[PDB]
Symmetry: C2
Subunit: 153 residues, 2 copies
């Protein structure tokens, strides 16, 4: 038993008036997102000098196509993840030499483009190893369920 | 198309040398965990005066059974989520009147026990509405896939 199943077992024992079933799926959802970010994805980003949020900004600019320049609002809408604190994240990226503010647009520098071109290859390799315990059909299956859960929000 | 599918589409266009397939499932995983915490679970915790991490501490103590007292190490291992910054989280809970440090043990106060007894009912109701777009079999299915992904870490 993992954290979530052990906790439901205890709750069923302590609060039999409760139906704690929903705790399994959502406890595993949040634990899986946390452990994968903390122990798998973020270490790789740190090897490139990046926080995960900073990777997303650079990746979003790169995949928007040349000249890799978006308004901060277009940047948020196109991001992989809808996290906050973006303005200071852009500030950091400009100070590091990876983005540039132009007219208002946020654009990759050449150094930033080279960095994310390098990092995204290592990232996807990292992701495949993260997912390798699931078969192809299991990954498609997990993506369909997460899509339905997400739209339900 | 959601964030993750739109981003894969762009990557496939921009870096056809890349296989970005892994981005869908893991992008949806992290986005779903974030949106559900930010927009659904944490608002409910805040109505009880709690941060999500603080809810977990109180819930872990309560479901460990009377006298609802655990060592900080037992507390971490029994938590629903393996998040950090726990020592300051305990500090805050003691200052709020909800936990007590005894001999070293962390124990619910009566006020803390009453609070989490109230909050956990609202929490599970909140979770069921979060999950209501998935059928029962879909929720069991999602919990099985997340379990396999998790153990693969």
């Amino acid at each position: 038993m993992d954290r979530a199943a052990h906790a439901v077992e205890q709750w069923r024992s302590e609060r039999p008036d409760l139906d704690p079933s929903s705790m399994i799926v959502l406890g595993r959802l949040q634990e899986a997102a946390l452990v994968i970010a903390r122990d798998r994805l973020n270490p790789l980003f740190a090897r490139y000098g990046l926080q995960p949020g900073e990777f997303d900004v650079l990746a979003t600019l790169r995949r928007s196509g040349a000249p890799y320049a978006l308004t901060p609002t277009a940047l948020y809408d196109a991001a992989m993840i809808s996290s906050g604190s973006m303005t200071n994240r852009i500030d950091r990226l400009e100070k590091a030499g990876w983005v540039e503010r132009r007219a208002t647009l946020v654009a990759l520098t050449s150094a930033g483009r080279a960095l994310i071109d390098d990092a995204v290859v290592a990232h996807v390799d990292n992701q495949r190893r993260v997912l390798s315990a699931l078969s192809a059909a299991e990954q498609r299956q997990l993506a369909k369920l997460l899509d339905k859960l997400l739209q339900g929000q």
